[PDB]
Amino acid sequence: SALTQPRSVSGSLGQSVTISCTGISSDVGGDNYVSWYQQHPGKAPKLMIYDVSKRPSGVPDRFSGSKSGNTASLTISGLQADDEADYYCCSYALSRVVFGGGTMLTVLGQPAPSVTLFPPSSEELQANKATLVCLISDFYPGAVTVAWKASPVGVETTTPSKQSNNKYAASSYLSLTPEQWKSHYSCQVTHE
Amino acid sequence: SALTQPRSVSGSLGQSVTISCTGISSDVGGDNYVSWYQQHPGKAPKLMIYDVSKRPSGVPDRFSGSKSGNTASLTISGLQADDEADYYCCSYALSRVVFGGGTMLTVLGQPAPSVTLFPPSSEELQANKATLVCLISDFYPGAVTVAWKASPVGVETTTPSKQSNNKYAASSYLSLTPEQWKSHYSCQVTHE
Amino acid sequence: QCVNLITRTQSYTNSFTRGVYYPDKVFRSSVLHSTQDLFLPFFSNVTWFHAIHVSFDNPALPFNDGVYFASTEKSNIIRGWIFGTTLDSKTQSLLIVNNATNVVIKVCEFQFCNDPFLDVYWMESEFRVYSSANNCTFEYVSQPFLMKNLREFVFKNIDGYFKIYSKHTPINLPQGFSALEPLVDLPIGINITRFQTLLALHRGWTAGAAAYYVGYLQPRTFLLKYNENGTITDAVDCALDPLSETKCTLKSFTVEKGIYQTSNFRVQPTESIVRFPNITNLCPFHEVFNATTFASVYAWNRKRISNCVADYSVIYNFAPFFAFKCYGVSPTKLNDLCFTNVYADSFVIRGNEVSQIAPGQTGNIADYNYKLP
Amino acid sequence: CYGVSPTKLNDLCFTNVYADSFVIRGNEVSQIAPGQTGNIADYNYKLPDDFTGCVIAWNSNKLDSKPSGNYNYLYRLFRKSKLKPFERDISTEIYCNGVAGPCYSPLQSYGFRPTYGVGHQPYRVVVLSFELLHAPATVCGPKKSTNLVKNCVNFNFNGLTGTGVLTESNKKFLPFQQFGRDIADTTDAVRDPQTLEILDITPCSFGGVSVITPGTNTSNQVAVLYQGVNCTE
Amino acid sequence: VQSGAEVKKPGESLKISCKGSGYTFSYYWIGWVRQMPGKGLEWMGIIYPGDSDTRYSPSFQGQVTISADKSISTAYLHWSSLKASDTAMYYCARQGDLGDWILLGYWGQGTLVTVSSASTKGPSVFPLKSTAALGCLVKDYFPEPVTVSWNSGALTSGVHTFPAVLQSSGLYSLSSVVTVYICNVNHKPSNTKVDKKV
Amino acid sequence: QMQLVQSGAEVKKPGESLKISCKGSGYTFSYYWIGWVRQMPGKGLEWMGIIYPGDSDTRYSPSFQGQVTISADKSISTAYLHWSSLKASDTAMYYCARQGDLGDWILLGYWGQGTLVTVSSASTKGPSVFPLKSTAALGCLVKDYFPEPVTVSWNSGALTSGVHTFPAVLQSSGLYSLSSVVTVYICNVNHKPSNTKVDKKV
């Protein structure tokens, strides 16, 4: 059997969230073989909830669990900014450790993205290159669109950023020849 | 059961001492479960006599033991100046070791103490303090009278002292104010 | 809720030949088989209860060595039986609910009311019998039990297994024989001492009445008669009268004229008497197993142990033993015996050399160091 | 394995096998047997004198023991009376007033620690209680079934081995009856596990063989008398 | 603190390690759990400090073996004939006195092993109106784990590093900003360090 | 030759549950019993228990069945003690001992260096040094220090001849004091509980 979990949830600051966990098996000896783990993005996982009938040491009291048949739930209250992390339910009734499908905790709240443009350097122009970089950051919503003007204009971009300052960031690298760049550019950013 | 030992004993240089210790139990397999240990003041204990019918390696031949019923005796010949230490009997017949009350071995011998005075520094006088220290040493007995002359004069002192160089010393710290220190002193010493 | 609504009265009726059931699930025909199990004695004085609600008074009936339940209520009022020993959520308790379809049999720590009943509101009852139950261990669901008709039931609790017998026979407790069939055998492993029936009513509670019979089983011996078809048609209670004892001894229902020597009578003991010496000092047993160093093989030492209360239970907490062979005595049945003088021979031998410490053995240690007769 | 063999077990059938699981102390594995007495026997778990099955038990020091103290395993030490075979007692009453301190708590805990050597380590016990009797068999071994032939072959009905002929019976076996038994305590009829028909078990033909012969000093020809058997049989 | 993950090819028998502390490696279970990029945790097996009664997952019976070091309390793993799908973040976990023997009380740091065969092409650094902030650009590098620092780490506040962008040619490109300067770029797979000043 | 060493001295408050260790070398550590001995200031010795490093068959004294536990790390041949719910009655010296090849398994063949555990509540008050016609010798005075294990040195220990140190004197106010003189200079005082070294010149 495989544990089924919601891929992504949407919480809120000050509100609560309940992460479901189904497919938990049981053997002779008990049925409370349910444990949760807290793993921050790019950090070390930490044991948060195990033996929901009890409370672990060091874990705040705003975390609790419940059992209902083969379905379990993780009740988390007091959502904060630093609470954004991955959570997985575990089952070890048959002496085998299984994990869920992964859960991403997102919180809502009150959020203007910073738009900057930089011309290509001299070292790129000497190498017959012209890279136009348009930087986007300091935006809470996950809606952003990158476009340039030549008439509309290889180009790659990455929407998600790394969890370092609790803020999203995106960047795009337009690679063009210097002859076509000197013959004319502006960055167009669409945001909510 | 509990082992019994004299707290303090008296000896002399070149004489012999027979430390007594009763309350030794026995079990099936033998009754010679008797051992002795020596611990100098401020040093780690050392095994001197175990299995009195035999002697350990490195221990001088002047140490020997014997058994008489439930009473054991530790015979030490030729008490030297460095033999002043504590001795304990040990019984391990019931798989549990027990120690006596401790026997402080003291020796007597042929012994005018040196009296010095040291005024406090300016750092104490500036801090409204005046510590008059009278140092006494070069005396054989373990007791000496410490006082000061104003008529004879908080103040604390230690009567005993560790056997660092087979001798005894004493020290006292008369805590007063700089005004009372400058108002007049002489250390009053009396030997037995 | 917990309301005392149902009242009950008592009466007595003679059970001529009721309570017979198959002791085993084996087919026998044209043969007389004798069995020894919990049966209902013939011509016993069973209690006839009468429950009625007019719109505390119904205590739990005992369950001494099983019970025999019978009822001729042709209106489907009896819907299960409660089984337990204290019935106050202290221990496990068996709860049976015989509803219309897919009956439920679950044992848990129920908090039974003073007068339990089912409140049918159609909709099933909201379980007004128990207050709360969470620490349950077993649950069983199967077909309904026996869905003027007379229904008979027999419940037994032997070596943890709960056996249920039942058989419905239309009647015009009349005479004759009607063997009961084994229906459900489920393990519970709980102490059952008191039991109480469940009366079903509709809810402003609707008035009604119900009557049932209760008979206590006893360890008996019957001589069952199987016909050519394989059904029990007659039985003999060997402990009823000496004539039935002669019938069971001769293994025949027809005893001719004569004198027969039956089983001898014996006066049963009234109480047990235990006589031991008045010594109260502890034993020196705590002087050999906790010894520092034993003696050699050729110089094995023994300790005479006498005038003590030898409590061998304190030896098991020290350490296990590779060899605990007790010759002539049992290791468990050792604290209930007396001895003249016990000697603890203590000696240390090599590991691979532990083969000759036994009667009649030979070797280097047996023939030269230590020999047992 | 009481009443059964540890190796000759995949060729038999059972009615309902129950696996009793519990962990006891190492040195306390002495009373898991019929007719035993002790603390765990008289207060915690008692086996009947007619027990049939394998009392499987092995060491579990690496699983049910912790250095900090594994106190989640309890055992009943005090009880008003001896425990009956196959009985459970989970009550937490104090064996006085509402609380203990004078009467004591009968639910003591084991000090399962890896420091304690053999004898105090936890041991997992799996009591595979078997009941092989005339009851209908619901669980059997991995042996495959063969075709049914009637009218002198060897038969094997739910582990019941034998030799005889099978004939259509006119009996009235009940739904809970699987085997039949005659006066001689032998099986005379059996119900097939696949089809619900009843077949009688009758031993094959036999009879005494009496040899009729004159003196050896006269002739060597002999006669054979099959007593009790007809010439057509 | 854990050892780095060197880029290896399938069939070189790489090794990972993890350092733990705060317990006695005598009777506490310890194991390893991997995590592939884009999926959750996968339990492989555990090992006992005494008699190594190792119990591996059914999907890891003959794919990985536990070779943890007991004398230094440092865990290790051994591989043989690896595959391309073996790139995962291996986490070392122990029993702990919180739960049962199978429950994981504590976890390690985790190291993301990378497997590729792009010959480990060397990186390149190129420089860039706000003055006020400056930045540098890193292009033409195939390996992903590339970090950029400023003045050898002398400035920490007001410094941000954006994730690399996957190019169509298989390479990557990273951008960094600093609040205002020499920008230092370190390439671990190639052991090449390039310095650039705006 | 066989050697044995323990950890440094520690001073904690009631309720911290400190941990001590002991390391040995030069012999098969897993085949020799090892234990600890309690020694209160001014009274006899007390035995807590021993442990076998091969398999930790710990045997504790009846007076130490629920006050302290003994453990040993077989992977590094290092013992480990653990005091639960430290109180004021644990201000005693702890000496470790081993079996050795002299006597039986219970006989203490050798001893360790010893570790002092002093229970206090002064929150580890910092020390203070003060320096001192007759010239001739110089000396320094250390006052206002609660912890006992405080040593005094001269010129970072470069001068040893003519140096003498007297035992500490405990005042009625609850503070110790000792005198250290040198035959004739900077006197250096090291405080172990606070890891603070104070320099003073006469």
GROMACS .gro file of N, CA and C in nm, chain C residues 316 320-321 324 332, chain D residues 22-33 36-37 39-40 55-60 110 112 118-126:
model
  114
  700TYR      N    1   1.475  -1.684   4.074
  700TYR     CA    2   1.455  -1.660   3.932
  700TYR      C    3   1.490  -1.517   3.890
  704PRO      N    4   1.908  -1.645   3.458
  704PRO     CA    5   1.867  -1.776   3.408
  704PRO      C    6   1.980  -1.877   3.421
  705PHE      N    7   1.948  -2.002   3.389
  705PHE     CA    8   2.042  -2.112   3.404
  705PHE      C    9   2.043  -2.197   3.279
  708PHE      N   10   1.868  -2.647   3.433
  708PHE     CA   11   1.779  -2.641   3.548
  708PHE      C   12   1.704  -2.773   3.565
  716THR      N   13   0.849  -2.568   3.928
  716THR     CA   14   0.739  -2.479   3.962
  716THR      C   15   0.670  -2.521   4.091
  779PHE      N   16   0.219  -1.195   2.272
  779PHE     CA   17   0.251  -1.120   2.393
  779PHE      C   18   0.400  -1.133   2.420
  780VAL      N   19   0.454  -1.034   2.491
  780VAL     CA   20   0.596  -1.028   2.524
  780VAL      C   21   0.611  -1.043   2.675
  781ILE      N   22   0.694  -1.139   2.717
  781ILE     CA   23   0.721  -1.163   2.858
  781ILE      C   24   0.872  -1.156   2.880
  782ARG      N   25   0.911  -1.158   3.007
  782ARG     CA   26   1.051  -1.149   3.043
  782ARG      C   27   1.124  -1.278   3.005
  783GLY      N   28   1.256  -1.266   2.989
  783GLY     CA   29   1.335  -1.380   2.945
  783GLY      C   30   1.332  -1.496   3.043
  784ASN      N   31   1.369  -1.470   3.168
  784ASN     CA   32   1.368  -1.574   3.270
  784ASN      C   33   1.227  -1.620   3.304
  785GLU      N   34   1.125  -1.545   3.264
  785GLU     CA   35   0.986  -1.581   3.291
  785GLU      C   36   0.927  -1.672   3.184
  786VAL      N   37   1.006  -1.718   3.088
  786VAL     CA   38   0.956  -1.812   2.987
  786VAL      C   39   0.978  -1.951   3.046
  787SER      N   40   0.888  -1.988   3.137
  787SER     CA   41   0.880  -2.124   3.190
  787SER      C   42   0.738  -2.173   3.206
  788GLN      N   43   0.639  -2.084   3.216
  788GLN     CA   44   0.501  -2.120   3.243
  788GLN      C   45   0.415  -2.125   3.118
  789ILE      N   46   0.474  -2.105   3.000
  789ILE     CA   47   0.397  -2.110   2.875
  789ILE      C   48   0.396  -2.256   2.832
  790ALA      N   49   0.304  -2.332   2.893
  790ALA     CA   50   0.289  -2.475   2.875
  790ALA      C   51   0.167  -2.522   2.953
  793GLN      N   52   0.115  -2.548   3.394
  793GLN     CA   53   0.220  -2.477   3.465
  793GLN      C   54   0.161  -2.379   3.566
  794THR      N   55   0.242  -2.346   3.667
  794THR     CA   56   0.203  -2.253   3.771
  794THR      C   57   0.309  -2.145   3.787
  796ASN      N   58   0.360  -1.678   3.845
  796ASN     CA   59   0.300  -1.545   3.842
  796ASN      C   60   0.231  -1.519   3.708
  797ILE      N   61   0.304  -1.533   3.598
  797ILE     CA   62   0.246  -1.508   3.466
  797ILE      C   63   0.136  -1.609   3.435
  812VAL      N   64   0.392  -2.332   2.074
  812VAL     CA   65   0.417  -2.211   2.155
  812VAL      C   66   0.550  -2.155   2.105
  813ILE      N   67   0.541  -2.072   2.002
  813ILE     CA   68   0.659  -2.012   1.941
  813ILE      C   69   0.704  -1.894   2.026
  814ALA      N   70   0.834  -1.889   2.056
  814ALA     CA   71   0.889  -1.782   2.137
  814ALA      C   72   1.036  -1.762   2.101
  815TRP      N   73   1.076  -1.636   2.087
  815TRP     CA   74   1.213  -1.602   2.053
  815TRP      C   75   1.250  -1.471   2.121
  816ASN      N   76   1.381  -1.443   2.124
  816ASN     CA   77   1.431  -1.324   2.191
  816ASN      C   78   1.408  -1.200   2.105
  817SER      N   79   1.372  -1.090   2.170
  817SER     CA   80   1.345  -0.964   2.102
  817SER      C   81   1.410  -0.848   2.177
  867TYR      N   82   0.803  -0.367   3.321
  867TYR     CA   83   0.932  -0.432   3.303
  867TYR      C   84   1.040  -0.328   3.280
  869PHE      N   85   1.295  -0.316   3.079
  869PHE     CA   86   1.363  -0.365   2.960
  869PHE      C   87   1.474  -0.268   2.920
  875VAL      N   88   2.085  -1.193   2.933
  875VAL     CA   89   1.982  -1.293   2.912
  875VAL      C   90   1.905  -1.315   3.043
  876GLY      N   91   1.775  -1.343   3.030
  876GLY     CA   92   1.687  -1.362   3.142
  876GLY      C   93   1.595  -1.244   3.169
  877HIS      N   94   1.644  -1.122   3.148
  877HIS     CA   95   1.562  -1.003   3.163
  877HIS      C   96   1.529  -0.935   3.030
  878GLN      N   97   1.581  -0.987   2.919
  878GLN     CA   98   1.549  -0.930   2.789
  878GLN      C   99   1.407  -0.970   2.748
  879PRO      N  100   1.340  -0.885   2.670
  879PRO     CA  101   1.204  -0.919   2.626
  879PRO      C  102   1.204  -1.034   2.527
  880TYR      N  103   1.101  -1.117   2.535
  880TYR     CA  104   1.084  -1.233   2.448
  880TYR      C  105   0.945  -1.230   2.388
  881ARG      N  106   0.937  -1.230   2.255
  881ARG     CA  107   0.808  -1.233   2.187
  881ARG      C  108   0.757  -1.375   2.179
  882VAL      N  109   0.631  -1.395   2.217
  882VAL     CA  110   0.567  -1.526   2.219
  882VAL      C  111   0.450  -1.524   2.122
  883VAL      N  112   0.445  -1.623   2.033
  883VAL     CA  113   0.337  -1.638   1.936
  883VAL      C  114   0.278  -1.777   1.959
   0.00000   0.00000   0.00000
